[PDB]
Amino acid sequence: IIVTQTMKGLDIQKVAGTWYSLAMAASDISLLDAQSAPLRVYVEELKPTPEGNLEILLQKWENGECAQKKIIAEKTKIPAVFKIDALNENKVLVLDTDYKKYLLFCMENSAEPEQSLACQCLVRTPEVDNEALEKFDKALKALPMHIRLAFNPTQLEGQCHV
Amino acid sequence: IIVTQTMKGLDIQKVAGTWYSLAMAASDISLLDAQSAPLRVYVEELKPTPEGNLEILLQKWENGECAQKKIIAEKTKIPAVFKIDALNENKVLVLDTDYKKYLLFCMENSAEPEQSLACQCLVRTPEVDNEALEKFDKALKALPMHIRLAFNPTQLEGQCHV
């Protein structure tokens, strides 16, 4: 069973700017297995809008090349849940953040969560933050994750994490 | 730093027979990332010999096809450490077992552990054993693992876990 717990009191304007994908996990191995997997996406920037919507700038491997992609996320009645239509997902969920160091988020397709749940640990600087990973793992503890990846500083500042 | 703790009091004759690869983890993402990764090997049978050596029967994806492979492991002065020359590894290490339900083991290349360390949780029946996974994760807690995979009952009785 998948139950996600979204952040209380999120202020979306404060997530603006540069981020790096430190770790990722998914419910289904095939979502992240291999560099061409559908949810192997590397977040570069979060750009909140004056409306309270959210643009997500990421890199992804498409047809043998590291491509730029932009996902537009629309705000909902819950401040930490956004609607999207990308990567066969329909929701972006913010689990936790302290704005200055780490942010944990998930994507899912609410119609098929077990087949679609992917979560990431983002950080502000291209270094390993063990405190952030511990928060990530504690969030993951109650979710049925079957693949987990964690990246090192060299991969964090590479193109598509290679 | 990589420090593995091998099992005290291992009786190798008692690991004989059928096993299934329930979970796997590695120090370097590329060791397990994608079905063709070098250490994506699925253990089918452990066959100890009268000499105290060990034959390991496994399946691996080679050139687009699920192939059978046999690794011969030679005993050393430490009962839980065996010498091999396969998969660019030189050691097989038994971390823990109760013989009847689970067995945890690693492979590594002692010259380059960070680049080569892969560990598995084996079980006797093609079911998820959460107690065995908890033992696996506790062993992994002190190792620098960057990729972890866990498989479900359908994958356990499939060909090359698909």
Side-chain angles (χ1 to χ4, degrees), chain A residues 58-122:
Chain A
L58 64 82
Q59 299 195 112
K60 178 179 194 294
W61 200 257
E62 310 217 67
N63 304 129
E65 289 247 293
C66 190
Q68 294 292 334
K69 183 169 173 73
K70 182 157 95 300
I71 295 183
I72 307 298
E74 185 177 44
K75 76 172 164 190
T76 72
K77 294 164 188 163
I78 300 173
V81 178
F82 297 81
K83 177 185 169 160
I84 57 162
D85 186 7
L87 309 176
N88 289 126
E89 304 284 37
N90 76 346
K91 298 207 180 187
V92 169
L93 311 173
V94 177
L95 306 185
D96 192 29
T97 186
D98 77 347
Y99 310 107
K100 307 183 291 177
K101 289 177 191 168
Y102 78 95
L103 183 147
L104 313 182
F105 82 97
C106 306
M107 290 177 277
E108 72 173 39
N109 188 309
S110 56
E112 302 293 332
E114 274 83 12
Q115 300 181 61
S116 69
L117 183 66
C119 306
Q120 303 200 182
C121 178
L122 303 186

Short mmCIF file of all heavy atoms in Angstrom, two decimals, chain A residues 58-122:
data_model
loop_
_atom_site.label_atom_id
_atom_site.label_comp_id
_atom_site.label_asym_id
_atom_site.label_seq_id
_atom_site.Cartn_x
_atom_site.Cartn_y
_atom_site.Cartn_z
N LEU A 58 14.74 20.03 -15.56
CA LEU A 58 15.53 18.82 -15.35
C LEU A 58 16.24 18.33 -16.61
O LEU A 58 15.90 18.71 -17.74
CB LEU A 58 14.65 17.69 -14.81
CG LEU A 58 13.53 17.16 -15.72
CD1 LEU A 58 14.05 16.16 -16.73
CD2 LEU A 58 12.44 16.53 -14.86
N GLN A 59 17.20 17.43 -16.39
CA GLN A 59 17.93 16.76 -17.47
C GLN A 59 17.53 15.32 -17.49
O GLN A 59 17.27 14.72 -16.44
CB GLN A 59 19.44 16.80 -17.24
CG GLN A 59 20.03 18.17 -17.17
CD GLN A 59 21.54 18.14 -17.29
OE1 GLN A 59 22.10 18.61 -18.29
NE2 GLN A 59 22.21 17.56 -16.30
N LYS A 60 17.46 14.76 -18.68
CA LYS A 60 17.08 13.38 -18.88
C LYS A 60 17.81 12.85 -20.10
O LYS A 60 18.09 13.60 -21.04
CB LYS A 60 15.57 13.33 -19.11
CG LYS A 60 14.98 11.96 -19.37
CD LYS A 60 13.48 12.08 -19.56
CE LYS A 60 12.80 10.73 -19.50
NZ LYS A 60 13.21 9.88 -20.65
N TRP A 61 18.13 11.56 -20.08
CA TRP A 61 18.74 10.88 -21.23
C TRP A 61 17.62 10.52 -22.22
O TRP A 61 16.72 9.76 -21.88
CB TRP A 61 19.49 9.63 -20.75
CG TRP A 61 20.54 9.12 -21.69
CD1 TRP A 61 20.44 8.04 -22.52
CD2 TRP A 61 21.86 9.65 -21.88
NE1 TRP A 61 21.61 7.87 -23.22
CE2 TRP A 61 22.50 8.84 -22.85
CE3 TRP A 61 22.56 10.73 -21.33
CZ2 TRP A 61 23.81 9.09 -23.28
CZ3 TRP A 61 23.86 10.97 -21.76
CH2 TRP A 61 24.47 10.16 -22.72
N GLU A 62 17.66 11.11 -23.42
CA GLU A 62 16.67 10.83 -24.48
C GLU A 62 17.40 10.57 -25.79
O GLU A 62 18.20 11.41 -26.23
CB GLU A 62 15.68 11.98 -24.66
CG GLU A 62 15.03 12.47 -23.37
CD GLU A 62 13.57 12.87 -23.54
OE1 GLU A 62 12.74 11.98 -23.82
OE2 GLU A 62 13.26 14.07 -23.38
N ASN A 63 17.16 9.41 -26.39
CA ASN A 63 17.79 9.01 -27.65
C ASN A 63 19.31 9.21 -27.65
O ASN A 63 19.86 9.91 -28.50
CB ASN A 63 17.15 9.77 -28.82
CG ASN A 63 15.65 9.57 -28.89
OD1 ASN A 63 14.88 10.53 -28.97
ND2 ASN A 63 15.21 8.31 -28.87
N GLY A 64 19.98 8.61 -26.66
CA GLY A 64 21.44 8.65 -26.57
C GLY A 64 22.10 9.98 -26.23
O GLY A 64 23.33 10.09 -26.32
N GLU A 65 21.32 10.98 -25.81
CA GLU A 65 21.84 12.34 -25.57
C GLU A 65 21.23 12.96 -24.30
O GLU A 65 20.06 12.73 -24.02
CB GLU A 65 21.48 13.23 -26.77
CG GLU A 65 22.26 12.92 -28.05
CD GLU A 65 23.19 14.05 -28.45
OE1 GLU A 65 22.69 15.14 -28.81
OE2 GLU A 65 24.43 13.84 -28.42
N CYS A 66 22.01 13.74 -23.56
CA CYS A 66 21.51 14.41 -22.34
C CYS A 66 20.68 15.66 -22.69
O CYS A 66 21.23 16.71 -22.99
CB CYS A 66 22.68 14.76 -21.41
SG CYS A 66 22.25 15.34 -19.74
N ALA A 67 19.35 15.52 -22.60
CA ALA A 67 18.38 16.54 -23.02
C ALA A 67 17.82 17.35 -21.84
O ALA A 67 17.71 16.83 -20.72
CB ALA A 67 17.24 15.89 -23.78
N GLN A 68 17.49 18.61 -22.10
CA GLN A 68 16.83 19.48 -21.14
C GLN A 68 15.33 19.27 -21.24
O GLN A 68 14.80 19.08 -22.32
CB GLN A 68 17.15 20.95 -21.44
CG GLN A 68 18.61 21.34 -21.26
CD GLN A 68 19.07 21.29 -19.81
OE1 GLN A 68 18.27 21.46 -18.89
NE2 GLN A 68 20.36 21.08 -19.61
N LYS A 69 14.62 19.30 -20.11
CA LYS A 69 13.18 19.17 -20.10
C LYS A 69 12.62 20.13 -19.05
O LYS A 69 13.29 20.41 -18.06
CB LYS A 69 12.78 17.73 -19.82
CG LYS A 69 11.30 17.42 -19.86
CD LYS A 69 11.06 15.91 -19.84
CE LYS A 69 9.58 15.56 -19.70
NZ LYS A 69 8.81 15.82 -20.94
N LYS A 70 11.43 20.65 -19.31
CA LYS A 70 10.73 21.55 -18.40
C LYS A 70 9.34 20.96 -18.12
O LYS A 70 8.58 20.65 -19.05
CB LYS A 70 10.60 22.95 -19.03
CG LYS A 70 9.90 23.97 -18.12
CD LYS A 70 10.25 25.42 -18.46
CE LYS A 70 9.21 26.05 -19.37
NZ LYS A 70 9.08 25.34 -20.67
N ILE A 71 9.03 20.77 -16.84
CA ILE A 71 7.73 20.25 -16.42
C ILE A 71 7.01 21.39 -15.71
O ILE A 71 7.56 22.00 -14.81
CB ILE A 71 7.87 19.05 -15.48
CG1 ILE A 71 8.49 17.89 -16.26
CG2 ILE A 71 6.50 18.61 -14.93
CD1 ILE A 71 8.61 16.62 -15.46
N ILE A 72 5.79 21.67 -16.14
CA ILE A 72 4.97 22.71 -15.54
C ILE A 72 4.02 22.04 -14.55
O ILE A 72 3.27 21.16 -14.93
CB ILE A 72 4.10 23.43 -16.60
CG1 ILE A 72 4.94 23.94 -17.77
CG2 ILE A 72 3.30 24.54 -15.95
CD1 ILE A 72 5.98 24.96 -17.40
N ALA A 73 4.02 22.49 -13.31
CA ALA A 73 3.19 21.89 -12.25
C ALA A 73 2.20 22.93 -11.74
O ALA A 73 2.60 24.06 -11.41
CB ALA A 73 4.08 21.39 -11.12
N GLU A 74 0.94 22.54 -11.67
CA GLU A 74 -0.13 23.45 -11.28
C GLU A 74 -0.49 23.22 -9.84
O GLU A 74 -0.64 22.07 -9.39
CB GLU A 74 -1.38 23.25 -12.16
CG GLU A 74 -2.48 24.27 -11.87
CD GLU A 74 -3.69 24.12 -12.78
OE1 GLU A 74 -4.13 22.98 -13.01
OE2 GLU A 74 -4.19 25.16 -13.28
N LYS A 75 -0.67 24.32 -9.11
CA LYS A 75 -1.04 24.23 -7.71
C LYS A 75 -2.43 23.64 -7.51
O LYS A 75 -3.25 23.68 -8.39
CB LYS A 75 -0.95 25.58 -7.02
CG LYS A 75 -2.09 26.54 -7.33
CD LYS A 75 -1.99 27.78 -6.44
CE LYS A 75 -2.86 28.91 -6.97
NZ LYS A 75 -2.56 30.18 -6.24
N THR A 76 -2.65 23.05 -6.34
CA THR A 76 -3.94 22.45 -5.98
C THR A 76 -4.36 23.06 -4.64
O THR A 76 -3.66 23.91 -4.09
CB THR A 76 -3.86 20.90 -5.83
OG1 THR A 76 -3.14 20.55 -4.64
CG2 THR A 76 -3.21 20.25 -7.09
N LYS A 77 -5.49 22.61 -4.09
CA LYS A 77 -5.89 23.05 -2.75
C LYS A 77 -4.92 22.71 -1.61
O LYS A 77 -4.88 23.39 -0.58
CB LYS A 77 -7.29 22.52 -2.43
CG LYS A 77 -8.38 23.12 -3.32
CD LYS A 77 -9.66 22.31 -3.24
CE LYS A 77 -10.69 22.76 -4.25
NZ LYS A 77 -11.74 21.72 -4.44
N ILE A 78 -4.10 21.67 -1.79
CA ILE A 78 -3.08 21.33 -0.80
C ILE A 78 -1.75 21.94 -1.24
O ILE A 78 -1.29 21.62 -2.33
CB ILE A 78 -2.93 19.81 -0.69
CG1 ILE A 78 -4.27 19.19 -0.26
CG2 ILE A 78 -1.80 19.44 0.27
CD1 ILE A 78 -4.29 17.68 -0.28
N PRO A 79 -1.12 22.79 -0.40
CA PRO A 79 0.05 23.53 -0.86
C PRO A 79 1.22 22.66 -1.33
O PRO A 79 1.98 23.08 -2.18
CB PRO A 79 0.45 24.36 0.36
CG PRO A 79 -0.85 24.61 1.06
CD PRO A 79 -1.59 23.31 0.90
N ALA A 80 1.32 21.45 -0.80
CA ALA A 80 2.43 20.55 -1.14
C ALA A 80 2.17 19.54 -2.28
O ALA A 80 3.03 18.70 -2.56
CB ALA A 80 2.87 19.84 0.13
N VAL A 81 1.01 19.61 -2.91
CA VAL A 81 0.63 18.73 -4.01
C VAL A 81 0.37 19.57 -5.25
O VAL A 81 -0.41 20.54 -5.19
CB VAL A 81 -0.64 17.90 -3.69
CG1 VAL A 81 -1.03 17.02 -4.86
CG2 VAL A 81 -0.39 17.03 -2.46
N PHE A 82 1.00 19.19 -6.35
CA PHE A 82 0.86 19.85 -7.64
C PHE A 82 0.45 18.86 -8.69
O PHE A 82 0.83 17.69 -8.64
CB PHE A 82 2.18 20.52 -8.07
CG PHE A 82 2.62 21.58 -7.15
CD1 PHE A 82 3.28 21.27 -5.98
CD2 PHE A 82 2.34 22.93 -7.43
CE1 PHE A 82 3.68 22.26 -5.11
CE2 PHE A 82 2.72 23.92 -6.54
CZ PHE A 82 3.39 23.59 -5.39
N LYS A 83 -0.34 19.33 -9.64
CA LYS A 83 -0.75 18.54 -10.79
C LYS A 83 0.21 18.70 -11.95
O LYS A 83 0.55 19.82 -12.30
CB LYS A 83 -2.15 19.01 -11.22
CG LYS A 83 -2.67 18.32 -12.46
CD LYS A 83 -3.99 18.92 -12.91
CE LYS A 83 -4.35 18.40 -14.29
NZ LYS A 83 -5.81 18.56 -14.54
N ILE A 84 0.61 17.58 -12.56
CA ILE A 84 1.43 17.60 -13.78
C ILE A 84 0.84 16.64 -14.83
O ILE A 84 -0.07 15.86 -14.55
CB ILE A 84 2.90 17.21 -13.51
CG1 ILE A 84 3.00 15.82 -12.86
CG2 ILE A 84 3.59 18.24 -12.62
CD1 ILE A 84 4.38 15.21 -12.96
N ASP A 85 1.38 16.71 -16.05
CA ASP A 85 1.07 15.76 -17.11
C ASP A 85 2.34 15.49 -17.89
O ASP A 85 2.55 16.01 -18.99
CB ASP A 85 -0.04 16.30 -18.02
CG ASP A 85 -0.52 15.27 -19.05
OD1 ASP A 85 -0.09 14.11 -18.98
OD2 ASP A 85 -1.32 15.64 -19.94
N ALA A 86 3.23 14.72 -17.28
CA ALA A 86 4.57 14.48 -17.85
C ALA A 86 5.14 13.20 -17.26
O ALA A 86 4.81 12.84 -16.13
CB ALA A 86 5.50 15.65 -17.56
N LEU A 87 5.96 12.50 -18.04
CA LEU A 87 6.62 11.27 -17.57
C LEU A 87 5.62 10.18 -17.15
O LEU A 87 5.94 9.32 -16.32
CB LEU A 87 7.58 11.59 -16.41
CG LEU A 87 8.59 12.73 -16.64
CD1 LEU A 87 9.41 13.01 -15.39
CD2 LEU A 87 9.49 12.39 -17.81
N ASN A 88 4.41 10.23 -17.72
CA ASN A 88 3.31 9.35 -17.34
C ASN A 88 2.89 9.47 -15.87
O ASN A 88 2.30 8.56 -15.29
CB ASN A 88 3.63 7.89 -17.71
CG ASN A 88 3.61 7.65 -19.22
OD1 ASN A 88 4.58 7.15 -19.79
ND2 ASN A 88 2.51 8.02 -19.86
N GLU A 89 3.18 10.63 -15.28
CA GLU A 89 2.84 10.93 -13.90
C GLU A 89 1.79 12.03 -13.91
O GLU A 89 1.67 12.79 -14.87
CB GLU A 89 4.09 11.44 -13.15
CG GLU A 89 5.28 10.51 -13.18
CD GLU A 89 5.14 9.33 -12.24
OE1 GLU A 89 4.04 8.82 -12.11
OE2 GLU A 89 6.15 8.89 -11.64
N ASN A 90 1.03 12.14 -12.84
CA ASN A 90 0.05 13.21 -12.71
C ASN A 90 0.15 14.07 -11.46
O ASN A 90 -0.60 15.05 -11.33
CB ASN A 90 -1.38 12.66 -12.93
CG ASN A 90 -1.92 11.89 -11.74
OD1 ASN A 90 -1.19 11.50 -10.81
ND2 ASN A 90 -3.23 11.66 -11.75
N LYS A 91 1.07 13.75 -10.54
CA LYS A 91 1.23 14.50 -9.31
C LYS A 91 2.72 14.67 -8.97
O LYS A 91 3.53 13.76 -9.22
CB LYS A 91 0.49 13.84 -8.13
CG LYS A 91 -1.04 13.71 -8.28
CD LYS A 91 -1.73 13.67 -6.92
CE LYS A 91 -3.25 13.54 -7.02
NZ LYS A 91 -3.88 13.67 -5.66
N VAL A 92 3.06 15.85 -8.46
CA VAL A 92 4.34 16.09 -7.77
C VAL A 92 3.99 16.42 -6.33
O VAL A 92 3.10 17.26 -6.06
CB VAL A 92 5.13 17.24 -8.43
CG1 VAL A 92 6.31 17.68 -7.57
CG2 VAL A 92 5.63 16.78 -9.78
N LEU A 93 4.70 15.80 -5.39
CA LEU A 93 4.38 15.87 -3.96
C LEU A 93 5.62 16.33 -3.22
O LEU A 93 6.67 15.74 -3.41
CB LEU A 93 3.98 14.49 -3.42
CG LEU A 93 2.93 13.70 -4.21
CD1 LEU A 93 2.76 12.29 -3.67
CD2 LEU A 93 1.61 14.44 -4.21
N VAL A 94 5.53 17.38 -2.42
CA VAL A 94 6.65 17.80 -1.60
C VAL A 94 6.47 17.19 -0.22
O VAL A 94 5.44 17.43 0.45
CB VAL A 94 6.76 19.33 -1.53
CG1 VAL A 94 7.90 19.74 -0.61
CG2 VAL A 94 7.01 19.86 -2.91
N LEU A 95 7.43 16.36 0.20
CA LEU A 95 7.36 15.66 1.49
C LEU A 95 7.93 16.49 2.64
O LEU A 95 7.36 16.50 3.74
CB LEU A 95 8.12 14.34 1.45
CG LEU A 95 7.76 13.34 0.34
CD1 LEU A 95 8.53 12.02 0.54
CD2 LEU A 95 6.26 13.06 0.33
N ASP A 96 9.07 17.12 2.40
CA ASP A 96 9.78 17.89 3.43
C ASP A 96 10.81 18.80 2.79
O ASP A 96 11.40 18.44 1.76
CB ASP A 96 10.51 16.91 4.37
CG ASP A 96 11.04 17.59 5.63
OD1 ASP A 96 10.45 18.59 6.07
OD2 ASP A 96 12.05 17.10 6.19
N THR A 97 11.07 19.95 3.41
CA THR A 97 12.17 20.78 3.02
C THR A 97 12.51 21.73 4.16
O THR A 97 11.65 22.07 4.97
CB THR A 97 11.87 21.61 1.74
OG1 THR A 97 13.04 22.31 1.34
CG2 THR A 97 10.77 22.61 1.98
N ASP A 98 13.76 22.14 4.21
CA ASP A 98 14.19 23.25 5.06
C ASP A 98 14.63 24.46 4.20
O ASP A 98 15.24 25.41 4.71
CB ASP A 98 15.32 22.79 6.00
CG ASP A 98 16.66 22.67 5.31
OD1 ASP A 98 16.74 22.69 4.06
OD2 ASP A 98 17.68 22.55 6.03
N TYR A 99 14.35 24.39 2.90
CA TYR A 99 14.64 25.46 1.93
C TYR A 99 16.11 25.74 1.65
O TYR A 99 16.48 25.95 0.51
CB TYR A 99 13.91 26.76 2.31
CG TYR A 99 12.46 26.57 2.60
CD1 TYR A 99 11.97 26.63 3.89
CD2 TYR A 99 11.56 26.29 1.57
CE1 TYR A 99 10.63 26.41 4.15
CE2 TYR A 99 10.23 26.08 1.83
CZ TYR A 99 9.77 26.16 3.10
OH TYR A 99 8.43 25.95 3.35
N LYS A 100 16.95 25.73 2.69
CA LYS A 100 18.35 26.13 2.55
C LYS A 100 19.31 24.98 2.25
O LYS A 100 20.39 25.25 1.77
CB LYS A 100 18.85 26.81 3.83
CG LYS A 100 18.00 27.95 4.32
CD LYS A 100 18.61 28.61 5.56
CE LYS A 100 18.57 27.71 6.80
NZ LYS A 100 19.23 28.34 7.99
N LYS A 101 18.91 23.74 2.51
CA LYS A 101 19.82 22.59 2.34
C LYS A 101 19.26 21.37 1.58
O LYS A 101 19.95 20.83 0.72
CB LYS A 101 20.32 22.10 3.70
CG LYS A 101 21.29 23.05 4.39
CD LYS A 101 21.64 22.50 5.77
CE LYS A 101 22.39 23.52 6.61
NZ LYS A 101 22.47 23.08 8.04
N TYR A 102 18.06 20.93 1.91
CA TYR A 102 17.48 19.74 1.28
C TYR A 102 15.99 19.94 0.97
O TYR A 102 15.31 20.78 1.60
CB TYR A 102 17.66 18.49 2.17
CG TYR A 102 16.70 18.44 3.29
CD1 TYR A 102 15.51 17.73 3.18
CD2 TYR A 102 16.93 19.15 4.46
CE1 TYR A 102 14.59 17.73 4.19
CE2 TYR A 102 16.02 19.16 5.48
CZ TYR A 102 14.86 18.45 5.35
OH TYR A 102 13.95 18.46 6.36
N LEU A 103 15.50 19.14 0.03
CA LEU A 103 14.07 19.06 -0.31
C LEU A 103 13.79 17.64 -0.79
O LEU A 103 14.52 17.11 -1.63
CB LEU A 103 13.71 20.05 -1.42
CG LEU A 103 12.22 20.11 -1.82
CD1 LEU A 103 11.81 21.51 -2.25
CD2 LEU A 103 11.89 19.11 -2.92
N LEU A 104 12.76 17.04 -0.23
CA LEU A 104 12.35 15.68 -0.60
C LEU A 104 11.07 15.78 -1.39
O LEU A 104 10.12 16.41 -0.94
CB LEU A 104 12.06 14.85 0.63
CG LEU A 104 13.09 14.90 1.75
CD1 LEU A 104 12.64 13.96 2.87
CD2 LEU A 104 14.44 14.54 1.19
N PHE A 105 11.02 15.15 -2.54
CA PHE A 105 9.78 15.13 -3.27
C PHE A 105 9.55 13.80 -3.95
O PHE A 105 10.45 13.00 -4.14
CB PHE A 105 9.72 16.27 -4.29
CG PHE A 105 10.43 15.99 -5.57
CD1 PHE A 105 9.73 15.53 -6.68
CD2 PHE A 105 11.78 16.20 -5.68
CE1 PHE A 105 10.39 15.25 -7.87
CE2 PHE A 105 12.44 15.94 -6.87
CZ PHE A 105 11.75 15.47 -7.97
N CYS A 106 8.27 13.58 -4.27
CA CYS A 106 7.83 12.42 -5.07
C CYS A 106 7.04 12.85 -6.32
O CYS A 106 6.54 13.98 -6.45
CB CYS A 106 7.03 11.37 -4.26
SG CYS A 106 7.79 10.72 -2.74
N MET A 107 7.08 11.97 -7.30
CA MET A 107 6.13 11.94 -8.40
C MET A 107 5.38 10.63 -8.45
O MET A 107 5.90 9.55 -8.11
CB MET A 107 6.83 12.12 -9.74
CG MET A 107 7.37 13.52 -9.95
SD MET A 107 8.25 13.63 -11.52
CE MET A 107 9.86 13.00 -11.07
N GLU A 108 4.14 10.71 -8.88
CA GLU A 108 3.32 9.54 -9.00
C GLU A 108 2.19 9.75 -9.97
O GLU A 108 1.86 10.87 -10.38
CB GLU A 108 2.73 9.08 -7.65
CG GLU A 108 1.64 9.97 -7.12
CD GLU A 108 0.97 9.41 -5.87
OE1 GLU A 108 1.67 8.84 -5.01
OE2 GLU A 108 -0.26 9.56 -5.77
N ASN A 109 1.64 8.61 -10.37
CA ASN A 109 0.36 8.58 -11.08
C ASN A 109 -0.68 8.02 -10.13
O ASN A 109 -0.65 6.84 -9.77
CB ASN A 109 0.40 7.75 -12.35
CG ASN A 109 -0.89 7.90 -13.15
OD1 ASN A 109 -2.00 7.73 -12.61
ND2 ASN A 109 -0.75 8.23 -14.41
N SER A 110 -1.58 8.89 -9.69
CA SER A 110 -2.54 8.53 -8.60
C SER A 110 -3.47 7.37 -8.96
O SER A 110 -3.95 6.66 -8.09
CB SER A 110 -3.36 9.74 -8.14
OG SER A 110 -4.03 10.33 -9.23
N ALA A 111 -3.68 7.16 -10.25
CA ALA A 111 -4.47 6.01 -10.74
C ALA A 111 -3.75 4.65 -10.53
O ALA A 111 -4.39 3.61 -10.36
CB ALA A 111 -4.80 6.19 -12.22
N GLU A 112 -2.41 4.70 -10.56
CA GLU A 112 -1.51 3.50 -10.46
C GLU A 112 -0.23 3.74 -9.65
O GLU A 112 0.87 3.69 -10.19
CB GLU A 112 -1.08 3.02 -11.87
CG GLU A 112 -2.20 2.66 -12.83
CD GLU A 112 -2.99 1.43 -12.40
OE1 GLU A 112 -2.41 0.54 -11.72
OE2 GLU A 112 -4.19 1.34 -12.75
N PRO A 113 -0.36 3.98 -8.34
CA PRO A 113 0.79 4.43 -7.53
C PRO A 113 1.95 3.43 -7.50
O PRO A 113 3.11 3.80 -7.68
CB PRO A 113 0.20 4.61 -6.14
CG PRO A 113 -1.29 4.56 -6.29
CD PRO A 113 -1.62 3.93 -7.59
N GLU A 114 1.63 2.16 -7.29
CA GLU A 114 2.66 1.07 -7.24
C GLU A 114 3.54 0.97 -8.47
O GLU A 114 4.69 0.57 -8.41
CB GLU A 114 2.02 -0.31 -7.01
CG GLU A 114 1.79 -0.64 -5.56
CD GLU A 114 0.51 -0.05 -4.99
OE1 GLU A 114 -0.35 0.46 -5.76
OE2 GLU A 114 0.38 -0.08 -3.75
N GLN A 115 2.96 1.31 -9.60
CA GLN A 115 3.64 1.28 -10.90
C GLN A 115 4.37 2.58 -11.27
O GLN A 115 4.98 2.68 -12.32
CB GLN A 115 2.64 1.00 -12.02
CG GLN A 115 1.90 -0.33 -11.92
CD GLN A 115 0.95 -0.50 -13.11
OE1 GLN A 115 1.38 -0.53 -14.27
NE2 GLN A 115 -0.34 -0.60 -12.84
N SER A 116 4.29 3.57 -10.40
CA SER A 116 4.67 4.94 -10.81
C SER A 116 5.40 5.81 -9.79
O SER A 116 5.87 6.90 -10.13
CB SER A 116 3.40 5.68 -11.28
OG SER A 116 2.54 5.93 -10.18
N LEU A 117 5.46 5.34 -8.55
CA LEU A 117 6.00 6.11 -7.45
C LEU A 117 7.54 6.22 -7.53
O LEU A 117 8.26 5.22 -7.42
CB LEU A 117 5.58 5.57 -6.09
CG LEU A 117 6.08 6.44 -4.92
CD1 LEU A 117 5.45 7.82 -4.89
CD2 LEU A 117 5.86 5.74 -3.59
N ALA A 118 7.99 7.45 -7.74
CA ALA A 118 9.44 7.79 -7.69
C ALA A 118 9.67 8.99 -6.79
O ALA A 118 8.97 10.04 -6.87
CB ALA A 118 10.02 8.03 -9.08
N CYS A 119 10.65 8.84 -5.89
CA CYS A 119 11.01 9.88 -4.91
C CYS A 119 12.50 10.28 -4.99
O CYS A 119 13.36 9.43 -5.23
CB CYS A 119 10.66 9.48 -3.47
SG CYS A 119 8.94 8.98 -3.17
N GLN A 120 12.76 11.55 -4.74
CA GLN A 120 14.12 12.10 -4.77
C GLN A 120 14.46 12.91 -3.53
O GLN A 120 13.59 13.52 -2.85
CB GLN A 120 14.33 12.96 -6.00
CG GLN A 120 14.07 12.29 -7.33
CD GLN A 120 14.74 12.97 -8.52
OE1 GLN A 120 14.58 12.54 -9.67
NE2 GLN A 120 15.47 14.01 -8.27
N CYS A 121 15.77 12.94 -3.27
CA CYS A 121 16.36 13.81 -2.25
C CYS A 121 17.18 14.83 -3.02
O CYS A 121 18.14 14.48 -3.70
CB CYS A 121 17.26 13.00 -1.34
SG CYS A 121 18.07 14.02 -0.09
N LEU A 122 16.76 16.09 -2.95
CA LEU A 122 17.47 17.19 -3.58
C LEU A 122 18.29 17.95 -2.54
O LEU A 122 17.89 18.06 -1.40
CB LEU A 122 16.48 18.18 -4.23
CG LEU A 122 15.49 17.66 -5.29
CD1 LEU A 122 14.70 18.81 -5.94
CD2 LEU A 122 16.19 16.87 -6.34
#
